[PDB]
């Protein structure tokens, strides 16, 4: 039977970028042609592989990462990028092999009073490793004195909210992103096109 890409793309609710979802896809037949001709994508870039060659390729596992970011932050979901999203929320390797799919989700993830459910990480002592997930909510220490879990001066809550409103400019509008990674190990493949 077919690989469940619809459970990822057609999900009614998406994850915050800092707590990005990952779906491990294994032991199924992948139908990429119907996957890529379904919705209207404002962003479709692939790296190290062509979208049309995936029907011929086999992989040990396939990963589908999904989250929501700003319009102006979509550019950071690519190999060799830097910025608040790539450094502190979701990071791709320089030799990434896979595809990045994004579409505007204003009609889904924006509220009249503002949708503050979606968050991102703002402060972090160091950058993330590729495909690392950090869900810490510890108070960030920006000074010499310790915070001891008390947010105040030089002691910041590490997460910031997006607050999507449907009337913003597209740079500030919510975008749902799907990143397809292709794990090729020295093990029998479980996913073929």
């Amino acid at each position, epitope marked *: 039977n077919l690989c469940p890409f619809g459970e990822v793309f057609n999900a009614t609710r998406f994850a915050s970028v800092y707590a990005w979802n990952r779906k491990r896809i294994s032991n199924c037949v992948a139908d990429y*042609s119907v996957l890529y001709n379904s919705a209207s994508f404002s962003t479709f870039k692939c790296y*190290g592989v062509s979208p049309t060659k995936l029907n011929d390729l086999c992989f040990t596992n396939v990963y589908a990462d999904s989250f929501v970011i700003r319009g102006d932050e979509v550019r950071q979901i690519a190999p060799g990028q830097t910025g608040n999203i790539a450094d502190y929320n979701y990071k791709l390797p320089d030799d990434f092999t896979g595809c990045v799919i994004a579409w505007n989700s204003n009609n889904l993830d924006s509220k009249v009073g503002g949708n503050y459910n979606y968050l991102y990480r703002l402060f972090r002592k160091s950058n993330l490793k590729p495909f690392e997930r950090d869900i810490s909510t510890e108070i960030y220490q920006a000074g010499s004195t310790p915070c001891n879990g008390v947010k105040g001066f030089n002691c910041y809550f590490p997460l910031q909210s997006y607050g999507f409103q449907p009337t913003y400019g597209v740079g500030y509008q919510p975008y749902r992103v799907v990143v397809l990674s292709f794990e090729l190990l020295h093990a029998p493949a479980t996913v073929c096109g």
Partner: antibody
Amino acid sequence: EVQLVESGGGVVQPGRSLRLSCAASAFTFSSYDMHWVRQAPGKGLEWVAVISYDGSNKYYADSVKGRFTISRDNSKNTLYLQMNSLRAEDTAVYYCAKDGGKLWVYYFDYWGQGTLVTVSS
Amino acid sequence: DIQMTQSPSSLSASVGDRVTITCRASQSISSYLNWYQQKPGKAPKLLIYAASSLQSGVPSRFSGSGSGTDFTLTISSLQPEDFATYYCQQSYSTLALTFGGGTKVEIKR
């Protein structure tokens, strides 16, 4: 002995449309991706669009997106490029290219002879 | 977007000379670098794919090497008909394929 024969170039007023064709021979056309690449006079090469082997998946460069359209008839072994809303910047020689099937990624192993499209009133 | 920078833009070498062309990428493109030759008034022809693979039918005086951001095309012994403009082209970003500016090779005599 792979051949790609093009036609359809000519003169066109800005805003009008034009349709190029490229007829392939001597290879399994319906299982290869096909490309369009253009070259403005005196300039370099620019990738325009790609279409999947079956013709379901199409991808365009930003400079022609929502304005050009690529298509193919596998029963006719012909590639197409529909060019609407033509601007002066679209003036170029347009090439079709067979995709080489030896890599996971695209590359142009055989090119058509090119046809000139001149956008001018 | 991944910029491809070729150097030099132009060069003159006599028949029999060794000629090397350099192509640099704004970011790592792994090994997906291709080389094309374009005679005047003729369509480009594939010479080298994936940094260093010889395309079928291409003479043996052509070769390639490089990985990451630096790649070279080498003509070991220049022949008169090798006068053309030589382009590199990255295929790592497969939906945003980009060429280099080209290197025009002229025959010194």
